[model samples]
Target: TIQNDIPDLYSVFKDYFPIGVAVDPSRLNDADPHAQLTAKHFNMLVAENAMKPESLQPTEGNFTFDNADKIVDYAIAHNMKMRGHTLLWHNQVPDWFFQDPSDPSKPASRDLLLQRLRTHITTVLDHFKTKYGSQNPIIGWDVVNEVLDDNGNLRNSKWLQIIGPDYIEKAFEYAHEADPSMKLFINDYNIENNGVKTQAMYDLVKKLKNEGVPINGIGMQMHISINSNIDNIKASIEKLASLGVEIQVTALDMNMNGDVSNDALLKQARLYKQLFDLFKAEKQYITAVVFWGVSDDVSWLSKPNAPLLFDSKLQAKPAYWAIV
Candidate 1:
């Protein structure tokens, strides 16, 4: 009844492209009411944290798949396409990920580090393939995320310090080797502002493409605000699209704080409409537009800011109407 009574986001955008939401393990459980809402409104799902390297392989030589399996199973059952949140990242990584077995205090050698990265990527991809087959709805993956700083310089992550700058290309290569069909992406935030960070992203993706790296897409983590520069956003999107790679407007939501007002809500709605219009116009290059979360109550940015299409009550906000 709820599905019939409310507007379905997937149905609204069916002819254009996928409408997606990031989900946590709890939301994948069929008993959760949010799961029902997800199935009705979203045709694509990404595990918010379950598929991350930290969550998957907490310790060396041991892997866990309980949460990831449940999430993928839910996607399969609901006929929803899936995206792996990430395979490599600096933050949230377990300490063991970079520790040298012989000396836990120091980083591992380049060879050892590469081996560990290969093992993790291969193990995760192999496990998914073995359990769900290669042809399943798990279509794309953020093979690497947030590797660059806001200044467009490589973040001094352990991966960069130990494995060298080529680590970015290597990660993409390893992911491709593990699953040729899976679309691999380099995802990052703050690239929609047409600044140094945006140029850095363009340079990196272009270099990867030129070098024959198996990068399939670039993910612009559009975690923006209602007052964000729309012109700059459009320019950044256009520039990235020119690189001949699919661009996914992932993690989209406004940044607001404290109390909500009718004027603020209306502004949020208009911003959403403006973004959707851009996506529609560039649908040829844009692959999907995935909201960061389904509801504000569970959002990562919900504390001072409610940046989701649904409110705490799981009711659609004006932003939802703008998209539909």
Candidate 2:
């Protein structure tokens, strides 16, 4: 059974969760309209995979606006706030992006790479803000996604491996030029502890902030586990909050072994409470908390996965009540 009605949960934690749900705007339809019910509990509606699916490929050629346009229109018509997800990432890149026009098989030069980046950001952001500017189109944007390696060095992503580290700086600069008013953020997962990866992101952001790169915030893709160390995660949040950048806990989910035990449930509850406490304590820069998926039925995590906060019937599990 579900632990609590989502609206009740939202009312209780409006000060914290502020209630939000994510949807792939491309899949939204009037028949299977779960999004309407989701909107009741959460005012913030974020578009997932907004830049993927091979249709909105913004590189090599030019900005293809069909999918992105549909997403923006959906958000506006629903009177929900939008998040411009993922200006750059290693995964979900178009096939042409991996090919060089000059060498065909070899990677494109840094100059050509920057040209693609600049044109993409300028064209997309300009179109979004211009068309839906009055509706407050996108409050925040994941300016870059998953840029760090597991060891805290810059990952050898296609952009980094082929174009080099300056890709990060160039991305931020171009995004700022495109939409100077939007809140710009660097987002990644598993950096929930004050470990090598977290520290590396901190140092990189510090350098960008020092260089006046128009970097506005950081988003921790806090995909939690039952075994996640509470103390280490708390310390990491404290450290990032102290860095004077806006912090958002994006894509939150807790996994267990599928079998619910008293001890396992208790541990998951403790993690939820501790994580929320960190947000409440540092409410200044921590603006939003977005779970990856609201219902286990539709959650991408549930396939071949066992420990998320929802059941097969879209019912909230113990972790759901605990978070609320």
Candidate 3:
């Protein structure tokens, strides 16, 4: 049995910022040991895959919130803040979304694609605002995800091919209109290490701000490794802070290259310390740090292959103590 005496991450970091964890709503409940630890530690919730595009709408105009509703209800019941994962992305959307309704041979036109996106964004936010209440001030929404390439160019996704760069703006526009209280963010990976991608994100946000767009924040999916550039991460944060938007460590996990030995775990602990130390210093701009998974065993990267604060046995790991 897990110890109620164990330190809870949210309370420990309560003074700094909200500590969040990603979860599959189906795997969470009071009876499950993992869920017990989840409720004890995290003060915020993010549905990892349950709230993804495909999960909510696998078919056109058929939106189901069975999975996501579990999460929203849990968060509300527990008083945990919530952050909606995404509203637009390249992957995991329904087939009919991109197919040409007029002519099966052709791709969706700019106008049709925009209309589809507008519908998805409006419908999703309306459902959540109505079901969950609009006054919650839940953290925000990832209005768009992974829209930039490593180089400083818009990713050549169908969104670009069909709707052009305006797709990004349209997404934020629709989301804000649906619920103006929520923050709007664009999420991407490999942005923690200062490079072309970070520069691209910087310019992209600058453009959005100058054009008076509704964008409110940026999500740095810090799915990193022991070899990640710590200096670059801080540099990128300081650089992007100039744009004056909220920055979040949306999906955080550090893998160890298949080496789960004690020494490797110790090394991992050191990195966590460094990260939390930085997070504490940058709390003014950094609103939240949400782990990608509740425990190593449940993570998308845990397949030696574990990279979360808790072990599979529901015990806190060195990484947990590091941040504490």
Candidate 4:
């Protein structure tokens, strides 16, 4: 109801591309006001945690779909497009995923790890397909997340340590096989800086595309700060676009303190405006610019400061106007 007076964000950019937010089931499953705001302002939704491997397959053989299913169902009922947060990642995974199922201490062998990856990907995607049918609203998936470090080196996470670099390729391959229609993305942070890390990302995506891998896009986390350079951000976007993969600004927010000042908020608004200007200019290659959260109070980076368009009271901040 509070948002009735505000300009709808989704409508402002509906013609350019879909705008989205990362949501948790706690907000969607309950009578939370945030959910209503989400439905009104965004056309796309990404399960913040419900769809991750840690939440979906906590046990080796037991797959839990309660929370994930609820989120997907909500998105469908509201006619919102969905993007799966992740299928494979190093963090938030159960111990059994890397440990031997029969023995907790020992690491699982390569073949066993590969099999586990395959099973999780296939089973999760299949479940969605069976429940929602082929015409599901989930148009994309973050098949892999945060696999690269800021230096552009492959993170020596359990994934690379166990299954090697080919794990990335295999993950994409399995996801495509599950549902070739869904756009698959490799999502990572720190790539918007136009640094070594950005080049590393470009190299990896290029290699995958050259090898005939079924990657559909690259997700720039874009979790930035007010002081971050806009020039570097534009350069990074152009470099990645040259690879010919669709790009998504999956998470756009800035770092600040919990007790942010009016001046700081204005600077944050300018940063968001500049970023959106670049996104609009490059709309040809960019697919979407998704804010990480709907309000500053609920953002993952909202500890000391708010990093979204709306303030704690669900009022539009200068940042919201800047984007529009």
Q: Give each model's whole-structure lDDT.
A: 0.87, 0.72, 0.87, 0.87
Q: Name the runs in model 1 displaced over 4 angstroms.
A: 1-4
Candidate 4 Cα deviation (angstroms), residue 86: 0.1
lDDT of 1 by residue, 1-324 (tens): 133487788888877889898988887656677887888889998888898888999888778899988889888888889888889999878888788998999889888888899999998988889888954678889999999998899999999999899998888888899999899999999999999999999998998899999999999989998788888999999998889999998788778766467788888999888888888888888888898888888888857676888887788889888877
lDDT of 1 at 269: 91
Model 3: lowest-lDDT 10 consecutive positions: 130-139
TM-score of each: 0.97, 0.89, 0.97, 0.96
Better of 2 and 3 by lDDT: 3
Q: Write the per-residue lDDT of candidate 4 for residues 50-122, one digit (tens) a residue.
A: 9889899988779999998888888888888888889988888887878887787888988999888999999
| Candidate 1, pairs of clashing residues | none
Candidate 2 stretches greater than 4 Å from native: 1-8, 30-33, 53-55, 257-267, 302-309
lDDT of 3 by residue, 207-233 (tens): 988998998999998998988878999
TM-score of candidate 2 to 2 decimals? 0.89
